[PDB]
Amino acid sequence: TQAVEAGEKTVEQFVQALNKGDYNKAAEMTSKKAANKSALSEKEILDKYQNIYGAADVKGLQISNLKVDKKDDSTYSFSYKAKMNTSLGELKDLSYKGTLDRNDGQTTINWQPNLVFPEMEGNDKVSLTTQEAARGNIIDRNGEPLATTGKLKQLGVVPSKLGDGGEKTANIKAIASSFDLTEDAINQAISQSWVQPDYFVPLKIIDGATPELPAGATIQEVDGRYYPLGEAAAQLIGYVGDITAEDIDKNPELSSNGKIGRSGLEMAFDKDLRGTTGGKLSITDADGVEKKVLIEHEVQNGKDIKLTIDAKAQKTAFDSLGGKAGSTVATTPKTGDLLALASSPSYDPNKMTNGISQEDYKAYEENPEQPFISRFATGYAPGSTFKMITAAIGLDNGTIDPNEVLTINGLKWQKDSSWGSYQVTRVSDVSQVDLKTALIYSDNIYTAQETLKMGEKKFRTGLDKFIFGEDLDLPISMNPAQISNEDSFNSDILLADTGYGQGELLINPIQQAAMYSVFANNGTLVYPKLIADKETKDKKNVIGETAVQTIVPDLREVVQDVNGTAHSLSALGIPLAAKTGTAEIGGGKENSFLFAFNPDNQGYMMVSMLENKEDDDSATKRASELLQYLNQNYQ
Ligand SMILES: *C(=O)[C@@H](NC(=O)Cc1ccccc1)[C@@H]1N[C@@H](C(=O)O)C(C)(C)S1
């Protein structure tokens, strides 16, 4: 019995070394090479495990139901069930039998080929055949392709069919002038270390018609991942990259020949899109005749993913940002369908996944506007659009009278002298300011005074009814929106600034569209949704129907009134309720904002923004095109 326990220890240390990929330490625990002991020596065991387990990408060896007894004086029989993960799936229910050995004062394992796999004997071999799974597509709400695998015209040059000297450079000048390429890059590709005189050295991919081919140029059709909208959805969709040996170590069920998602939805939906590798893991005769099959199943291609994104709206929302820093979110506010999640500036996902130069990748990573950032998922201070939330809270708790008219003189104000020199500032000097006037001219002092009158406790009671701190059920990495840094402002100055959306507030464009959906659902909050088939989740009684019926008419005037901050949108001639905003970010860096939706049918809602805006630039100047599209197609 005392020796049976030391034997149970060696069986667990043997399977642990196998589980850790240390096939050598497990080899040093076997017996000496003999007839009834170990069939092979140490270096031969290390190679047989490294060859076989390495070929099948065996990982995560775990055992259960250990039964260790005693046969005679020095040999202890031991058995157990075991399971492991391979590149073809999970090998479960493995009956491992064997004998131990307890000569001297320690216990070794009488190694046998049946310890690699159960039914192995002698010089049996292991075979593995695999068939790659085609990656599934990503499609918009109407079936248009967003991420697909298809045929690509790959332009490349062969050094021999190019020339000997003078004619070689003339063809390089022709290929660099016929496909919009660099003359220093064609000679930099044909002079790498892997190049041979007769090798097809690839260059770029022609995304259109193929011009005349100079001497040395040739087109080889190959299959790869393609993104139709390209950079217009690069942050959302993402890109796939070549699977490395480290990926296979983490998840053996990947296809080391295939691609893996590196960012965006391509990474978030990698398991659903990549499918399952098919094939057969068999044991063969000493000559190669198939003996016993361990795993086998057909290749199952990846499943498609249908998004709520509108492909035509996604391209228009992105193009309207003119390559400047910003982002736009468009929703159907009654259901939450995310029609567009544009972010600018962007990167080329096709060039990123079809072979990207090391120089271009550095430009993408050092660009100060940071193209890789998903700005629709980045938290910002909302600015003056947040006055709709503050006003609705004051209407709900009976602090705001819509017809009550505050008297504000000048462009600066402070509660009392204890504020030192900080003063709430407004842009328009209007003496008589009610709720309708304050929303039209975007008056901070009205918002600040009415926030302080309301107080912090009544303010947060209305704020807590929203989604501050919640994690949205979305396949997008994102931090939850926050009211402030702590659970209490502990400052009337910070309380006032939060009133008009310039405190420690952090709300990303997607969360803003979720919070502002109350004005399209009679005060019900409708959570945003990215997968088309998913159910519509809502949140009743966030603000009162009284406040919605009061603010939305005023938001119509933010567009229609001659002095409204969004009056340029009245040129569209469409029903619009909107609210602009310009957030100060502490030189003076400003973020332009625009909220807008159709108050007649609630068919669409839009939240656009510019980050670190240039002068006389705004989200309002760029919304005319996207608003015209959403008005015609989403009613
Ligand atoms: C809301 O964002 C308000 N802006 C401020 O309180 C700070 C500010 C920023 C830039 C210039 C002046 C003041 C108001 N809303 C914006 C807007 O709706 O675009 C205004 C420029 C009207 S100030």
DSSP 306-327: EBS--HHHHHHHHHTTTTSSEE
Resolution in A: 3.0
Instruction: Determine contact, residues 508/235, Cβ cutoff 8 Å.
Output: no
Instruction: Determine contact, residues 594/619, Cβ cutoff 8 Å.
Output: yes
Instruction: Determine contact, residues 116/49, Cβ cutoff 8 Å.
Output: yes
Q: Which helix (H) or strand (E) holds 581?
A: strand 577-585
Active site residue 384: yes
Q: How far apart are CA 556 and CA 567, in angstroms?
A: 10
**How many C-alpha atoms does 268 have within 13 Å on its Cβ side?**
16
Instruction: Determine contact, residues 551/392, Cβ cutoff 8 Å.
Output: yes
Q: How far apart are CA 192 and CA 441, in angstroms?
A: 63
Instruction: Determine contact, residues 576/546, Cβ cutoff 8 Å.
Output: no
Q: Percentage helix, strand, coil, to 5, in the chain?
A: 35, 25, 40
Question: Mutate which of 442, 500, 591 to test ligand 1's pocket (most atoms within 8 Å of Cβ)?
Answer: 442
b/e code 349-385 from CB counts within 10 Å (16+ = b): bbbbbbebeeeeeeebeeeeeebebbbbbbbbbbbbb
Tell me the two tokens of residue 443: 């008056």
Q: How far apart are CA 441 and CA 592, in angstroms?
A: 16
Helix axes of 492-499 and 456-463: crossing angle, nearest 10 degrees:
40
**How many C-alpha atoms does 321 have within 13 Å on its Cβ side?**
34
Q: How far apart are CA 240 and CA 255, in angstroms?
A: 13
Tell me the two tokens of residue 131: 């068939």
Instruction: Determine contact, residues 49/109, Cβ cutoff 8 Å.
Output: no
- The one-character DSSP state at 529 is B
* Greatest alpha-carbon span in the chain: 105
Give start-end residues of each CATH 3.40.710.10 domain in the chain: 312-360+369-633
Give start-end residues of each CATH 3.10.450.100 domain in the chain: 2-123
Give start-end residues of each CATH 3.90.1310.10 domain in the chain: 230-307
- Note the CATH architecture for domain 230-307: Alpha-Beta Complex (3.90)
- Note the CATH architecture for domain 2-123: Roll (3.10)
Q: Which residue CA neighbors atom 11 of ligand 1 most closely?
A: 582
3-state secondary structure of 633: helix
Instruction: Determine contact, residues 45/111, Cβ cutoff 8 Å.
Output: yes
- Note the CATH architecture for domain 312-360+369-633: 3-Layer(aba) Sandwich (3.40)
CA 179 to chain centre: 33
Helix axes of 492-499 and 444-454: crossing angle, nearest 10 degrees:
120
Question: How many Cβ atoms from other residues are within 10 Å of residue 304's Cβ?
Answer: 15
Give start-end residues of each CATH 3.30.1390.30 domain in the chain: 149-226
Torsions phi, psi for 412 (to 5 deg): -140, 150
3-state secondary structure of 541: coil
Tell me the two tokens of residue 482: 């926050």
383 lines ligand 1 (CB under 6 A): yes
Tell me the two tokens of residue 398: 């009976």
3-state secondary structure of 388: helix
Instruction: Determine contact, residues 76/70, Cβ cutoff 8 Å.
Output: yes
Question: How many Cβ atoms from other residues are within 10 Å of residue 146's Cβ?
Answer: 23
Q: How far apart are CA 309 and CA 427, in angstroms?
A: 37
Which residues, 6+ apart, have CB-to-CB distance to 143 below 8 Å? 306
Q: Going by DSSP bridges, is the β-strand pair 259-263/239-242 parallel, antiparallel, or unpaired? A: antiparallel
Q: How far apart are CA 446 and CA 438, in angstroms?
A: 6
CA dihedral 552, 557, 559, 561 (to 10 degrees): 180
Nearest CA to 499 among 389, 593, 401? 389
Residue 345, preceding peptide bond in cis (omega within 30° of 0): yes
Q: Which residue of the set 320, 344, 346, 384 is catalytic?
A: 384
444 lines ligand 1 (CB under 6 A): yes
Choose the CATH number for 149-226 among 1.20.1440.230, 3.30.1390.30, 3.40.50.9100, 2.60.40.10: 3.30.1390.30
Q: How far apart are CA 263 and CA 450, in angstroms?
A: 44
- Taking the centre of ligand 1 as the mean of its atom positions, its distance from the CA of residue 427, in whole angstroms, is 7
CA dihedral 169, 172, 178, 180 (to 10 degrees): -120
